[model samples]
Target: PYADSFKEFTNIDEARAWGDKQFAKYKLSSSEKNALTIYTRNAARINGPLRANQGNTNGLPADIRKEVEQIDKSFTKMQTPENIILFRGDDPGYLGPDFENTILNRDGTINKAVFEQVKLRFKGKDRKEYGYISTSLVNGSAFAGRPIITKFKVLDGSKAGYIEPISTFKGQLEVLLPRSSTYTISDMQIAPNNKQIIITALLKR
Candidate 1:
């Protein structure tokens, strides 16, 4: 019997292309496009070649590892050390399991389980899901900054005071996270009135 072979990519472009095709239905800004592209490339390398290879000799660990490091360095270089505050607007459901398992702690405190070990990934929605990190946050409108977010004040993308928002529709602000990275949930707010949730998951680099 033959074991199933998962589709593998040979390069970042191939890995990056998959996301473009996957999220083609949405409108992505050049900044969102660039960030998501790099984020996808990193995820593929970490989850695919690197994880599959481990200590095995038949994998492209060296190249894959190098690329991940290079991109991570790029993100680090362009980003300011100050904490970046991003806003994401999402409806009641949609991310239930993800929320229950990761962000929302029944204890009303830090979720140590997924604190800084889990990866957050989303392709966004409509014209906004690229993760509206605020125009002021951007240095000349570039996507460079570390994590931090809040979901209230901009509930349902109506009260957004920044530039373009990450979530525009019933559920937007979905974005692809960078690879070889993890995050911690800093703060959260649930506005039952507006039926939206805001979060600020800070990155642990």
Candidate 2:
């Protein structure tokens, strides 16, 4: 969980409509409200760490209680905030060599052919299968904004790690996905599927 609140439409009218829907159908928890605060602060803090690389690396302001919030929210039958695979484009200020790495070729184009090669396999073709293509960052950083995607399969639905989506990008550039948290991310084959680097489920609750 990188930021405080999820990147939602802040437009007053839009928010009012959504608030109305939630007021009618959903119960907003104090935990959810607190989680929103942490996520939002995390977003602001992001201008440093993953962005400008400043201040403390204490991670999301020491208040990212995504785990606690999960318990409070209790998975309901609602649409449940979608966990999407967030791929990266060129970030604005992420300074790492890999931070801003992007898909742009030397000609400053999207390098569609290469990008498609990496981005399309998760479409559930061939031997590949994805319960969900969580997120696909065409550029996740600044300097390189290297393309990153992530996915998961729900082998078990009870735990947080049971194949869900990513949580947030550290900044609009890249994201720092805490273990078992959900955000917008998906995984793809950097090489062909035959490569030893098969996408493996790394972190879990």
Candidate 3:
């Protein structure tokens, strides 16, 4: 019964090696790499829908590209990470206009003000200081029947905080994981210095 839900690595070392290669291939920065590692280990499996792809900035979503154009009319380097930014949506499951309003403008550009507000909602000093996971990679059916853990803190005495069985944590966790199960949080760690509450609990299915 649990066959499809679980996977076995040849060994932990091999898994680490494979993860390392993907990080380099994706050209993730230190912060991105760190968060991805945590997400891979705790949030979901490698083949899970919640995992993101690694590629050039051109691989970013269409709306995001349009937003960059709006930000800088002459923006030639759309491939740059600075231009291809990603942010966590306040409401993961509902990516409709209501949810979009929290992070994007009416024209679909990022709502700078709202983004700032959402940034402050976390335990960080400022929005600019926080790193975000892509909304696209974290939505869908991968969370079905799994033991899901939404955002949980390490230093704060928080538990695994599991969500409903066989469901995703979307529109739930502070980070973002659309149509997901459910969970809760508190006092996040500082980024670049501490692990800042991990996005979810260890992967299980």
Candidate 4:
């Protein structure tokens, strides 16, 4: 259900036009593409379709690159601790059944093992964040879900972000962490009516 359905919603995005315009303005260097690549193993369904690759998704990489430097001058010189934060959605199965099965048993209470393991397997050895956030968030829900909503609060505020704006417009809050940050699960919940999932994380020093 997630594979195709998630693809459908991700594609239906009315957000792409504006986003693409932003993406079209810049060119992707190998360094830039490498920044967008995913190193960790996640559900292939969303991972494959959801990634901002090839032609890309909603021009996110371009706009994001433009804004990141504004937020943090040393963005390119990132660290391993300052987790970035953004609200984005995802396919419910992104972490995979095996991953979920591990945490499902914990049943909603915060689990250290689960948290550590669930951390996005992103190997952004380089790269950088903001106006892109609100625009991207609008573009997010269209891509995802139980629909899951995740939010991240980074320790390094300037490094992580806050473009003076945004929307849930709700489902996933794709809290994009900076290579500059790591985080702990702050809150998690499910919308009873539709079984929508929400994941909130707080980045730490």
lDDT by residue (1-205, candidate 2, tens digit) is: 3222323232434433443453334453556444433443444433333232222234434433343334225334123233322332223122224323444456544444544553463333323211112222222223232333233322222222111112242323222232233222234444342211223222231
Pick by TM-score: which candidate is best?
4
lDDT of 1 by residue, 92-194 (tens): 2334465544544554443444433322333121112112122222112121221222321111212112112222311122233333333444444443332
User: What C-alpha lDDT do the candidate models reach, one value each?
Assistant: 0.34, 0.32, 0.28, 0.37
Tens digits of per-residue lDDT for model 4, 1-205: 1111111123324334423332333333444333333211122322233243422345445444433333233233322222233456655354567565554333444344554455543222211221222212233534442355655444432333211112122333222333333445555655453334556555444
Residue 87 alpha-carbon offset, candidate 4, angstroms: 0.9
Descending-lDDT candidate ranking? 4, 1, 2, 3
Worst 10 residues of 4 by lDDT: 1-10
Worst 10 residues of 1 by lDDT: 154-163
Q: Where does model 1 exceed 4 Å of error?
A: 1-63, 81-83, 88-184, 192-194, 202-205
Please give the lDDT score at residue 72 for candidate 2. Answer: 29
lDDT of 3 at 128: 18
lDDT of 2: 0.32
**TM-score, candidate number 1:** 0.31
